[PDB]
Amino acid sequence: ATVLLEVPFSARGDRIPDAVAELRTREPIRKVRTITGAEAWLVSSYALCTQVLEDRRFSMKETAAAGAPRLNALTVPPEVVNNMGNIADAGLRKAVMKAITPKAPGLEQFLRDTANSLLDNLITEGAPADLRNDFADPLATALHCKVLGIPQEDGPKLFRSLSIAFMSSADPIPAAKINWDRDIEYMAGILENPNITTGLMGELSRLRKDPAYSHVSDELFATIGVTFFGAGVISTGSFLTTALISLIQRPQLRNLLHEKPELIPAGVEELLRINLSFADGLPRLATADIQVGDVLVRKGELVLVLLEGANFDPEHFPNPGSIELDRPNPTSHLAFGRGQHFCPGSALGRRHAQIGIEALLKKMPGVDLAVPIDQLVWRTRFQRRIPERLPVLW
Numbered sequence: 001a002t003v004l005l006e007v008p009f010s011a012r013g014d015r016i017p018d019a020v021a022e023l024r025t026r027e028p029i030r031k032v033r034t035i036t037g038a039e040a041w042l043v044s045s046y047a048l049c050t051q052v053l054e055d056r057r058f059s060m061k062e063t064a065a066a067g068a069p070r071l072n073a074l075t076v077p078p079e080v081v082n083n084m085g086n087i088a089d090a091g092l093r094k095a096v097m098k099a100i101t102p103k104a105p106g107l108e109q110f111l112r113d114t115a116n117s118l119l120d121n122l123i124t125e126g127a128p129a130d131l132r133n134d135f136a137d138p139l140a141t142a143l144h145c146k147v148l149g150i151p152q153e154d155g156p157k158l159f160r161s162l163s164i165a166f167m168s169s170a171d172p173i174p175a176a177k178i179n180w181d182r183d184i185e186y187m188a189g190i191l192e193n194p195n196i197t198t199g200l201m202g203e204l205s206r207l208r209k210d211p212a213y214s215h216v217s218d219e220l221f222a223t224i225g226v227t228f229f230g231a232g233v234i235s236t237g238s239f240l241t242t243a244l245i246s247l248i249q250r251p252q253l254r255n256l257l258h259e260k261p262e263l264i265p266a267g268v269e270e271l272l273r274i275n276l277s278f279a280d281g282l283p284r285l286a287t288a289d290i291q292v293g294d295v296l297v298r299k300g301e302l303v304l305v306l307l308e309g310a311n312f313d314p315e316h317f318p319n320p321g322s323i324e325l326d327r328p329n330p331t332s333h334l335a336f337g338r339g340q341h342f343c344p345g346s347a348l349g350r351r352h353a354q355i356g357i358e359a360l361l362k363k364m365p366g367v368d369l370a371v372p373i374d375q376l377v378w379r380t381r382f383q384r385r386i387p388e389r390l391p392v393l394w
């Protein structure tokens, strides 16, 4: 006898387990057990993943309900799970979206300057260098301080919350509350700080004092700062890091992008498609009985949308494991999700990776791993897959 198949399958972000293709072919929706002991439906084909993400009856908000089957423990207050809904209801959606576009004057030049400075410092210190801790993550942190309008020097402390904040735990995490409350207090202070007049926090600070937003809560304003910093930094840092691994392991592609940097955006789109940064399927709770493939999902059940299931589906992306810059459907991947909860930071995430890679290939065209790839240490029980260190030489 064996127990029910458990998720997640592997914390490794450098290879996809054979089990994914097996499931997709034989049972593209099937029952699994999560780390909490709850059962869930794991969805692994492009067609069924898209169906679930495009049907709001599969609800993000309702995953926070007391007594629901859980993927993992909440690390934020339950009301915050409906973060974008709260922002929308407060009439703040357009303003937030405008503030986080990569098109702000000077933002791209800031990114390039920052990337180049980080790389120069690594070159000065000499190989080996750690491209996660001393390149990808600081670049993400710097970008988000700039986008938020907050001091660069405050980035490191806010960043240190994230190795706990984005845990995927079977049980509640006491440290997550301590850090959350402290970070909320910080953002509340920012809203009252006369020095803060640019970026997302500068804009929220002004809207907060405008009559049309007088009954929007201070808690919501602070929460927007905390969640956008955290989600943005962890997502961009983790994606860039694992994308660099995929690039390093493809010297032919690395050379092509070095020689023809105009191809970098198409390269980054393919790196998004094959990215294994999300450690768990995206969770939704059924609010009705809904047929998905051969399964009638019942009201109250948990569904997990496996992004790499969709993104490596050969029925949608032929030769799915290969990076091919000339696909006819290049942005149709699910790396940023789909539907109601599509990533609001997609443009900024793309630009972060494009500029980081462009800078790295120019400064370190001979970049390569400094340890055998199996020596990378993959973070466990976390909402992202990432190597603890990424040692390179050049």
Ligand code: HEM
Residues within 6 Å of the ligand: 060, 083, 084, 085, 100, 227, 228, 229, 231, 232, 233, 235, 236, 239, 277, 282, 283, 334, 335, 336, 337, 338, 340, 341, 342, 343, 344, 345, 346, 348, 349, 350
């Ligand atoms: C390569 C970088 C990024 C990737 C791969 C990524 C991925 C995703 C995905 C897959 C979702 C959907 C979650 C779901 O439907 O359950 C999402 C949502 C979200 N992302 Fe991103 N993201 C990235 C960058 C960013 C950035 C830069 C920001 C903000 C600055 C951000 C903020 C958010 C927020 C606030 C949500 C919640 C949306 C909602 O609840 O409707 N992300 N992200």
Ligand SMILES: Oc1ccc(-c2n[nH]cc2Oc2ccccc2)c(O)c1
Residues within 6 Å of the ligand: 075, 076, 080, 081, 082, 083, 084, 161, 165, 166, 176, 180, 183, 226, 227, 228, 229, 230, 231
């Ligand atoms: O400082 C932070 C920031 C974000 C989170 C978080 N945990 N889980 C999901 C998180 O971030 C979001 C982001 C958007 C909507 C809801 C939550 C967190 O646990 C701490």
